[PDB]
Structures are given as C-alpha cells and as structure tokens.
C-alpha cells in the first residue's frame, strides 16, 4: 500500500556548480626561446651554437 509518511522524503543537493573536463586549458603555458633551452644540469641543451 502507498503510505504518504513512508514515501515523503527531502532530497538535498547543491544549488549549482560548473563541471570542467580539460584542466590544462586553465594553464597558460609558454616556452623559452630554443636557443636558451637548458637541460637538467642547468646548461644549454646544445652548446656548439
């Protein structure tokens, strides 16, 4: 049998939010000039110039 007391509930959620997928789109990524690019040892990748 249908019982109103047993069927009435309060559903709770958030009012609104925006879900994002591409996190890296929020990053402005630039690079140094290749002439000035350095390796792990802080020296230029290519030194013969």
């Amino acid at each position: 049998q249908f019982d109103f007391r047993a069927s009435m509930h309060m559903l709770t959620s958030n009012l609104t939010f925006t879900v994002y997928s591409d996190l890296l789109a929020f990053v402005s990524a630039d690079t140094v000039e290749p002439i000035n690019a350095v390796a792990f040892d802080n020296m230029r990748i290519m030194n013969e110039l």
């Binding site: 000039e33 002439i35 000035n36 013969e48 110039l49």
Partner: protein, 49 residues
C-alpha cells in the same frame, strides 16, 4: 645567442680556394674551436680593449 658559423664561413670564403658549399657545419665549428685558442693580434686586441 650568436651562432659563429657565419664567421668561419666568411673566413673560408675569403681564403678564396675552398668551396664553402662543400664544407659541412661540423668542420666549420671545429675550425671555430681551433681559432678560439689563438691569441688575438696586437692591434686588434688593443682596439677591442
């Protein structure tokens, strides 16, 4: 940021007996390395001083 291949290329061109089109860049940079070890001529060195 200065690539010194142009200097050695002009040097070889001014020697007037080599065809720089036949000279790879590695040989030019070896010439650069050898030239780098020579002392500068007195007049040029004093002008640069």
């Amino acid at each position: 940021q200065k690539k010194m291949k142009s200097i050695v290329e002009d040097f070889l061109k001014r020697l007037q007996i080599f065809d720089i089109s036949r000279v790879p860049d590695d040989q030019m940079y070896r010439l650069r390395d050898r030239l780098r070890l020579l002392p500068v001529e007195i007049r040029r060195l004093d002008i640069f001083n």
